[PDB]
Structure 1
Amino acid sequence: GPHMATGQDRVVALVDMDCFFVQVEQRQNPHLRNKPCAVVQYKSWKGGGIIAVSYEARAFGVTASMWADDAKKLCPDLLLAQVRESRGKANLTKYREASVEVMEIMSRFAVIERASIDEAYVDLTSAVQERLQKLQGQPISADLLPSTYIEGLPQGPTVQKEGMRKQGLFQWLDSLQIDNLTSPDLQLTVGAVIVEEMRAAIERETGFQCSAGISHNKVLAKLACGLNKPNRQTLVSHGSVPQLFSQMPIRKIRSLGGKLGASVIEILGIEYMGELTQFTESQLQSHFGEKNGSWLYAMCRGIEHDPVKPRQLPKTIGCSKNFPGKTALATREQVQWWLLQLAQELEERLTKDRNDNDRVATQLVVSIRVQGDKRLSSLRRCCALTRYDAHKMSHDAFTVIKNCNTSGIQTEWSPPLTMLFLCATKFSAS
């Protein structure tokens, strides 16, 4: 009873940009705004591969991981923006730079953890305490939460979407006890007020819209964010978890979308997150290991302790290119030319990074894939990165992989290379 932790100690948000690369291209080119449109990389092979899709285009069934030629079958009027190509490869700089715009705005409100190119976690616990004291026990107006959904509401004793949202928000606010500054539900609500402000700032200052989730930890905040996309935010309270989880497929929770999640389902013979509550912590630890078992035991009750790391910048800077099918690199000079191309982009990004961020990478990781290997990486070797020079880095890369060449002829490369990867790691302050 009184000693059972409820995982309600923090307020955590997850902010995720809507259709992000598409919004970046729509800002740049007003002709793409309010249209079915997608972002594609390359073109020759089946029209190029789609990697982002506007909500208008999703209505036609267009998805990412779709070839443009196939997308055009579903949506003949689909508009397409191409990823830039430099040095023979896709270059994602425009989107990385747009990401920095958003991340810097978020950082004004709180410490953030960059979780991907288009999303960050926010620990709002301290900010909420401060807003609560300014507030002085004053009720929170629905007007302060104009894009917020309360998951699970309305409920109990109109047929339009915005009407339903307000109904649920009214029920939530009607029940709140604004008298208690330590009330977790109140804390989440104030968190949601701050995230409205954050999201308004992002849209004002960049033109980009986003969604967000507000909860007590990262996993629930992430889950919440997706419940009402696009351009909306969702509050998932501790109390909402039993109903939410009672029909939530296990694979929907972050980290369970792969083999572990499949094993939870198979071994325990369950389907939904809530079904996990019936197992003891030791039972879960016995199947999934000590760490996973404890994590699952807490997570299925809405509890998770993973901190929001104070890290706004990526820890690694990498450059990679596939050489599929027939385009696989079969000559040494091919290999050396592409290592140089990758190394030149890497040097460019590294030099910019050193100037912007006062740090230097000290380790170069070189990775290749070989034709036939199911595995995405076949081989990964590290060497010292002592100087930001593309020719040195590419020469060094060649040295660490040169022995991979099975071919008795040194001019020939066998088996042909289907991937090259250069990655700068182990930063030190500079």
Structure 2
Amino acid sequence: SRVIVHVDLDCFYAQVEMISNPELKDKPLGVQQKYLVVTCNYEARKLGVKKLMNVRDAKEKCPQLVLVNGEDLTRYREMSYKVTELLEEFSPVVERLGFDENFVDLTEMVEKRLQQLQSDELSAVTVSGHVYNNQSINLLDVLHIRLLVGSQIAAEMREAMYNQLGLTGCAGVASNKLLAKLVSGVFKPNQQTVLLPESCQHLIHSLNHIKEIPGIGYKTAKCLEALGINSVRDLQTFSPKILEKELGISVAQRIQKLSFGEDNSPVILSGPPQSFSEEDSFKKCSSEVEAKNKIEELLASLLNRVCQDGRKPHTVRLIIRRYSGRESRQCPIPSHVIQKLNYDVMTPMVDILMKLFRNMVNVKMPFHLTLLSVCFCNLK
């Protein structure tokens, strides 16, 4: 049996901004990227603003909305890493999911604490936060005890995140990653909940669409929908044989297990990132001249990042998106270029990126690009 916590920061980008400019802490705030409000603080959500909503919709429904620009992710990324490092201090196995979510495997920590316990104050063990579905605790049930100690650790985590980084968030504690992530959002914002095993089925059947299961995305949901599968129960009861043939043995067996609340995937230590990338989207790029300036701009940003990181990238990738869905070209970085960080690495790197660009884009015939991205990977 495992004890897993999922930590999910409240309106992360908005929190980072409200900390940067505390004069926003009291007003409805929205963080904008191009024409989207990607996230907003809880005051704005109260005024009917939704995640990933159009700035037109948002401006009309809530003309008092204060917008800050969140296209440069630098500060969010930096705070994101402070959070996971703080969690890694609790237990070293921490898996990041995007910038604002972490899983921690607490089972070793829980076991250590229980061993230190006397029967005197084992009486006595208490929950911190909400119990999912108001389920009764059985102090004689060792699984219940282990999960409650988890909720205590989770509370210490949220307290340290607030006290040391100024950030609030939710936590969900359960026996695997799927359930911990489903349960962490039951009470929001800035609260936590623990899932006892006999409420597992209640949690999974509380979902309304199979897309709400982590692991089942747009494409997979579409296939399932095609098969007449709509509820969690539908997926639970659909023919394994048929499903296996429709989506392949790997996806079928995995997602069908997910529909019963079963997930044996380990919490993986994320550690340092395996790639660095920067991108810009735009309405139109139809010339190599600006394509180069664009790319130079991105390359500038990236180099600062590999600079302070330490490790060195052994491959570059250039990515594009044409009008009306992405294409990419990569190649190893010349060994001599790799030794760069106090000379002029720009020019030779731009040279390589442009060769890659022309290989993928016919510059002798009109082109219409709508995104450019540069990615460094294969770090050593």
Match of 1:421 in 2: 373
Distance 1:276 1:335 in 2: 47
Residue identity in the other structure for 1:262: K
CA, structure 1 residues 279+109, in 2 after alignment: closer, same or farther (shift >3 Å)? same
Distance 1:16 1:247 in 2: 20
Match of 1:86 in 2: none
Deviation at 1:124, TM superposition (A): 0.6
Deviation at 1:135, TM superposition (A): 2.2
Q: Note the 1:226-241 alignment, pairs <5 A.
A: 226-241=185-200
Deviation at 1:276, TM superposition (A): 3.1
Q: Is 1:247–1:274's contact at 8 Å kept on the other side of the alignment?
A: no
Match of 2:304 in 1: 348
CA, structure 1 residues 238+286, in 2 after alignment: closer, same or farther (shift >3 Å)? farther
Residue identity in the other structure for 1:417: L
Residue identity in the other structure for 1:39: V
Match of 1:45 in 2: none
Match of 1:223 in 2: 182
Distance 2:7 2:232 in 1: 23
Distance 2:239 2:133 in 1: 27
Equivalent residue in structure 1 for 2:69, among 64, 71, 82 = 82
Q: Could you tell which deviates more after superposition, 95-104 or 295-304?
A: 295-304
CA deviations over 1:21-58 (Å, ceiling 9, x no partner):
1000111211111331111135xxxxx42121111101
Deviation at 1:303, TM superposition (A): 1.4
Match of 2:88 in 1: 107
- Are positions 1:385 and 2:341 aligned together? no
Distance 1:266 1:25 in 2: 42
Match of 1:33 in 2: 25
- Are positions 1:116 and 2:98 aligned together? yes
Match of 1:63 in 2: 50
Distance 1:274 1:214 in 2: 24
Aligned residues: 368
Q: Note the 1:252-271 alignment, pairs <5 A.
A: 252-267=212-227, 269-271=228-230
Q: Is 1:209–1:231's contact at 8 Å kept on the other side of the alignment?
A: yes
Deviation at 1:312, TM superposition (A): 3.0
CA, structure 1 residues 262+329, in 2 after alignment: closer, same or farther (shift >3 Å)? closer
Could you list the structure 1 runs, at least 4 aligned residues long, displaced by more than 4 angstroms after superposition.
Answer: none
CA, structure 1 residues 284+234, in 2 after alignment: closer, same or farther (shift >3 Å)? farther
Distance 1:253 1:134 in 2: 37
Residue identity in the other structure for 2:196: S
Distance 2:50 2:298 in 1: 29
Q: Note the 1:188-337 alignment, pairs <5 A.
A: 188-248=147-207, 249-267=209-227, 269-279=228-238, 281-324=240-283, 328-337=284-293
Q: Note the 1:1-12 alignment, pairs <5 A.
A: 9-12=1-4
Identity of aligned residues (%): 30
Match of 2:314 in 1: 362
Equivalent residue in structure 2 for 1:73, among 37, 60, 64 = 60
Distance 2:67 2:188 in 1: 22
Structure 1 alignment gaps of length 5 or more: 1-8, 43-47, 84-89, 155-170
Deviation at 1:208, TM superposition (A): 0.6
CA deviations over 1:73-124 (Å, ceiling 9, x no partner):
11122122223xxxxxx32111111111111111111120111111111011
Match of 1:139 in 2: 123
Q: Is 1:21–1:95's contact at 8 Å kept on the other side of the alignment?
A: yes
Q: Is 1:106–1:198's contact at 8 Å kept on the other side of the alignment?
A: yes
Distance 1:34 1:234 in 2: 27
Give TM-score, length-normalised by structure 1: 0.81
CA deviations over 1:109-146 (Å, ceiling 9, x no partner):
1120111111111011101101111223413454x61x
Deviation at 1:64, TM superposition (A): 3.0
- Are positions 1:176 and 2:139 aligned together? yes
Give TM-score, length-normalised by structure 2: 0.91
Deviation at 1:285, TM superposition (A): 2.0
- Are positions 1:22 and 2:14 aligned together? yes
Structure 2 alignment gaps of length 5 or more: none
Distance 1:275 1:416 in 2: 44
Q: Is 2:275–2:376's contact at 8 Å kept on the other side of the alignment?
A: yes
Q: Is 2:172–2:181's contact at 8 Å kept on the other side of the alignment?
A: yes
Deviation at 1:361, TM superposition (A): 1.5
Q: Is 2:125–2:148's contact at 8 Å kept on the other side of the alignment?
A: no
Residue identity in the other structure for 2:233: G
Residue identity in the other structure for 2:317: V
Distance 1:321 1:344 in 2: 13
CA, structure 1 residues 400+236, in 2 after alignment: closer, same or farther (shift >3 Å)? same
Q: Note the 1:369-408 alignment, pairs <5 A.
A: 369-372=321-324, 375=325, 377=326, 379-386=327-334, 387=338, 388=340, 389-408=345-364
RMSD of aligned residue pairs (Cα, Å): 1.9
Q: Is 2:329–2:360's contact at 8 Å kept on the other side of the alignment?
A: no
SS of equivalent to 1:52: strand
CA, structure 1 residues 407+298, in 2 after alignment: closer, same or farther (shift >3 Å)? closer
Distance 1:404 1:257 in 2: 29
CA deviations over 1:198-244 (Å, ceiling 9, x no partner):
11000110111011111111111111112212101121232212222
CA, structure 1 residues 75+213, in 2 after alignment: closer, same or farther (shift >3 Å)? same
